Design a protein around this nucleic acid. Structure first.
Ligand SMILES: Nc1ccn([C@@H]2O[C@H](COP(=O)(O)OP(=O)(O)OP(=O)(O)O)[C@@H](O)[C@H]2O)c(=O)n1
Ligand SMILES: [Ca+2]
Ligand SMILES: [Ca+2]
Ligand SMILES: [Ca+2]
Ligand SMILES: [Ca+2]
Length: 903
DNA sequence: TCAGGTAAGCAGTCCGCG
DNA sequence: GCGGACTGCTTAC
């Protein structure tokens, strides 16, 4: 089989590589790699190396990597560009693996782990590491085994051996409910003493050294704790055994106030699952506890225990150990669903980077382009210093706040990447500039045609049409991968709606799930078989359909993020190909495209209605338009439609057969106008929105830019079994909005769009009646807390102190001596509650770490001094007043005199 | 901690305002 | 009270 690398590090003049050989085996080698960099040479030296601009360069092959980095510095102080790959381990992989890598994940050791530490004096600080490590669970992907290291004897308590039998039992039964399917995969190892546990945990680590190391907060807690504790007990060097090359780099001290620790282990790729999740999941969560993410992702219950975690081992050692095991498995379960490890490996190997570099699209693109250019004997330019400068982005139309009954939206496929490819935007394809007319003049096709020769953007930039730039070329490859994955994702989505529909009339039989591939649209045969299936079978098929969609999503949305990040990276000063003339060439072209097509759609729809100057496009943002379909419905009748699906069908047919071809001609003309390389402005119908036929629903509403709600029946060709609310930007969508209030507001909106005003009014009264009885957490606001030290003058609130930062300082002055109180962590999220004046906390709000209950000692005083009135007004009533007034509806009646009375 | 991006809404602070 | 200048935060794209 084909060779592939696992990890690569540069340690002095040595490249340290772990890899898989042609026989499927893991090996390791130290290489004194001889790197090459480049200088511009006179037009006399018959060389085969040229820069991207086509200017000759002489190759300089250094004896070692120290001399190369030295040469770079000497070139700088001489004022001359030193061209080539300055990150030598990237050059090394390029040379060593000069082909498209075909990797085998089965041969990659993926390890998932976590530890436990009992601490009777606050959060067991990883930097200090003064409390014994009393549990470690380590899952090895290759063995498929959960290795459990359990400490029986400690200064903080002598405990009994963990029991797999009790662990397997359900919590209803007094067990711990360790999932049944991993019980036979647990290798349990107990210990008389902390030293012999750590030594054995070092041995096995050498025997089964992780390539990919992950888990939950492993970079921030587990890795620095295991390192530092072995450092405090055995010393250094023995601690360095965690590295296959026995080289670590402690950073780290990030104060104030303060004061944490981060460890780099050379030869291991640390992909903290929390960081994978933040980057690739496309969520923004109110909490990042494993308990909260697991519930969200997997619908599993929280890991409940009695009393503080500082006394859990002592009071229930059994549960302590089970919960440590379960924590490790939850990350595996989250990953089986989300498949971020798979995604990290796909990308890392495609770019030929260290896998942990997939967090950086600048690194990723730098290596993709480097490899692309090297393969053509081209030489990459030196990275340069640039000042951070603002630059313009997208156009967003100002909507008239109103209700909008029937709406069809249209949106461009992969806009910024498509623009890159259409205009041929690249560092080396810059041809020149032209005199820029105001944007409005290009939008209205009245300005002089910019060029008859080059491919233009309305920001004044001209590009060669003839040759293909490296940026278009490489963005195209990844776009085509995204297209394929998105194709699978939408098929699984359509298939999911087929099953949901069938679930309306499930059959009374038994009966097995059909053995189908959910990535492909169901055939008629399969759809007929589906209509005959039981609920049980249908439900299992739905789960599989949704799992397939989710995998499809991860694959597609993160390739979209990658190619979009190339557009953004042209505007980041740390990118080798940073160029604001290219970054704005995209954004400005996008502004023109949107407004150009708004004009063409209005003109077409006016033409077909035989009118003039009516505005049909009601809104647009970046690359999308929203078109009022009222007249289209009202012209044919409304009573002529047998059902909702009949008019959805009608609008679908209209957009496809009438509007899309008009849109197609419009954009083709724009391409000619800008004399672009390739027409790639492909705008397809996205949403079809409206109220249920015969209802009093308002269908949709806008309050302002980036703030609207729509009742959608079809999204990009997915005909839903039940209408879906597409709500953008409103409080329902915000992670700062209380949990209960998100749901309440969504139901307010549902009733507005589907059922109408009386229905809303009925619901409002119900929620206002129940509010005070809801759980304090579910009704608490959420906020990230940055720069706490900046507004800490007391610790009392300083000048212009943010409301939530005030809450945090009010918190800190209540849990002063409390050793068992959780500390707010700079950058993390907090719940925030208003307090009634006169309260004992001495301020108008209290904030505390999100995802946790507030401490026992102060909990009851928060509850008694909570200001429900101010809370209900802030989080529920005020936003709702925004929605309803834009929609021209009331959530409440009158006031006003009577009353009437009954007696 | 160390390197995609901009546009833009709302919560809240502070203060001007006869 | 409301509004404008401003910071902070979180969203749409
Ligand atoms: N995180 C994001 C999302 C959007 N945009 C930009 O806004 C454009 C439109 O965004 P959107 O329609 O959400 O994505 P598209 O890239 O056009 O992809 P799709 O085909 O899914 O619509 C993108 O091309 C780009 C961006 O820079 N970064
Ligand atoms: Ca789009
Ligand atoms: Ca099968
Ligand atoms: Ca049926
Ligand atoms: Ca869009």
């Amino acid at each position: 089989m084909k060779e592939f690398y696992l990890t690569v590090e540069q340690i002095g003049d040595s490249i340290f590589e772990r890899y898989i050989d042609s026989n499927g085996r893991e090996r390791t080698r130290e290489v004194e790699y001889k790197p090459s960099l480049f200088a511009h040479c006179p037009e006399s030296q018959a060389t085969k190396y040229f820069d991207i601009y086509g200017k000759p360069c002489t190759r300089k092959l250094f004896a070692n990597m120290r001399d190369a980095s030295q040469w770079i510095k000497r070139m700088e102080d001489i004022g001359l560009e030193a061209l080539g790959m300055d990150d030598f381990k990237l050059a090394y992989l390029s040379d060593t693996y000069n082909y498209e890598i075909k990797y085998d994940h089965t041969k990659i050791r993926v390890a998932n782990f976590d530890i436990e530490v009992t601490s009777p004096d606050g959060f067991p600080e990883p930097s200090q590491a003064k409390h014994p490590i009393d549990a470690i669970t380590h899952y090895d992907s290759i063995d498929d085994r959960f290795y459990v290291f359990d400490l029986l004897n400690s200064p903080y308590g002598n405990v009994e051996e963990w029991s797999i039998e009790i662990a397997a039992k359900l919590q209803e039964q007094g067990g711990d409910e360790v999932p049944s399917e991993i019980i036979d995969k647990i290798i349990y190892m107990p210990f008389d003493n902390e030293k012999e546990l750590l030594m054995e945990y070092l041995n096995f680590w050498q025997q089964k050294t992780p390539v990919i190391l992950t888990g939950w907060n492993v970079e921030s807690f587990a890795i620095p704790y295991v390192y530092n504790r072995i450092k405090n007990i055995f010393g250094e060097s023995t601690a360095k055994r965690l590295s296959p090359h026995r080289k670590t780099r402690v950073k780290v001290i990030e104060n104030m106030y303060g004061s944490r620790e981060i460890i780099t282990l050379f030869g291991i790729s640390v992909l903290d699952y929390i960081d994978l999740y933040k980057k690739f999941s496309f969520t923004n969560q109110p909490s990042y506890s494993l308990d909260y993410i697991s519930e969200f992702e997997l619908n599993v219950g929280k890991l409940k225990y009695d009393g503080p975690i500082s006394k859990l081992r002592e009071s229930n050692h059994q549960r302590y150990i089970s919960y440590n095991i379960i924590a490790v498995y939850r990350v595996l379960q989250i990953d089986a669903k989300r498949q971020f490890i798979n995604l990290s490996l796909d990308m890392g190997y495609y770019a030929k980077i260290q896998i942990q570099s997939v967090f950086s699209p600048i690194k990723t693109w730098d290596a993709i382009i480097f490899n692309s250019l090297k393969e053509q004997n081209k030489v990459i330019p030196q990275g340069r210093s640039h000042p951070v400068q603002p630059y313009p982005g997208a156009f967003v139309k100002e909507p008239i706040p109103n209700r909008y009954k029937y709406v069809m939206s249209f949106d461009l496929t992969s806009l910024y990447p498509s623009i890159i490819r259409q205009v041929n935007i690249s560092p080396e394809t810059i041809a020149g500039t032209f005199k820029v007319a105001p944007l409005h003049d290009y939008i209205n096709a009245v300005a002089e045609r910019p060029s008859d020769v080059y491919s233009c953007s309305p920001n004044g930039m001209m590009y060669y049409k003839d040759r293909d730039g490296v940026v278009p070329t490489e963005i195209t490859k990844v776009f085509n991968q995204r297209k394929e994955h998105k194709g699978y994702m939408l098929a699984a989505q359509r298939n999911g709606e087929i099953i949901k529909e069938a679930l309306h009339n499930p059959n009374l039989s038994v009966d097995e799930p059909l053995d189908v591939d959910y990535r492909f649209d169901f055939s008629d045969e399969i759809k007929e078989k589906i209509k005959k299936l039981s609920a049980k079978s249908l439900n299992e098929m739905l789960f599989r359909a949704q799992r397939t969609e989710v995998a499809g999503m991860t694959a597609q949305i993160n390739r979209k993020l990658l190619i979009n990040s190339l557009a953004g990276a042209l505007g980041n000063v740390w990118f080798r190909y940073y160029d604001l003339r290219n970054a704005t060439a995209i954004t400005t072209f996008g502004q023109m495209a949107l407004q150009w097509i708004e004009r063409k759609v209005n003109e077409y729809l006016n033409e077909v209605c035989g009118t003039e100057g009516e505005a049909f496009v009601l809104y647009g943002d970046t690359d999308s338009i929203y078109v009022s379909a009222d007249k289209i419905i009202d012209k044919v009748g409304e009573s002529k439609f047998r059902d909702t699906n009949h008019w959805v069908d009608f609008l679908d047919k209209f957009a496809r057969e009438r509007m899309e071809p008009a849109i197609d001609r419009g954009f083709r003309e724009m391409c000619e106008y800008m004399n672009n390389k390739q027409h790639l402005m492909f705008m397809d119908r996205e949403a079809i929105a409206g109220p249920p036929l015969g209802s009093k629903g308002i269908g949709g509403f806008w309050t302002g830019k980036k703030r609207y709600a729509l009742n959608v029946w079809d999204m990009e060709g997915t005909r839903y079994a039940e209408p879906k609310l597409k709500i953008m930007g409103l409080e329902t969508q915000k992670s700062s909005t209380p949990k209960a209030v998100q749901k309440a507001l969504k139901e307010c909106i549902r009733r507005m769009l589907q059922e109408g005003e009386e229905s809303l009014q009925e619901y409002f009264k119900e929620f206002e009646k129940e509010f005070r009885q809801l759980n304090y957490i579910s009704i608490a606001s959420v906020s990230s807390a940055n720069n706490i030290a900046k507004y800490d003058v007391g610790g009392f609130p300083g000048p212009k102190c943010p409301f939530h930062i005030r809450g945090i300082l009010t918190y800190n002055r209540a849990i002063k001596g409390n050793i068992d109180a959780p500390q707010v962590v700079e950058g993390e999220k907090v719940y925030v509650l208003p307090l009634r004046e006169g309260n004992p906390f001495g301020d108008k709000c209290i904030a505390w770490p999100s995802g946790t209950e507030i401490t026992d000692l102060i909990k009851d005083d928060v509850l008694h001094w909570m200001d429900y009135t101010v809370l209900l007004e802030k989080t529920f009533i005020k936003p709702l007043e925004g929605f309803t007034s834009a929609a021209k509806l009331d959530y409440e009646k009158k006031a006003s005199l009577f009353d009437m009375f009954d007696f």
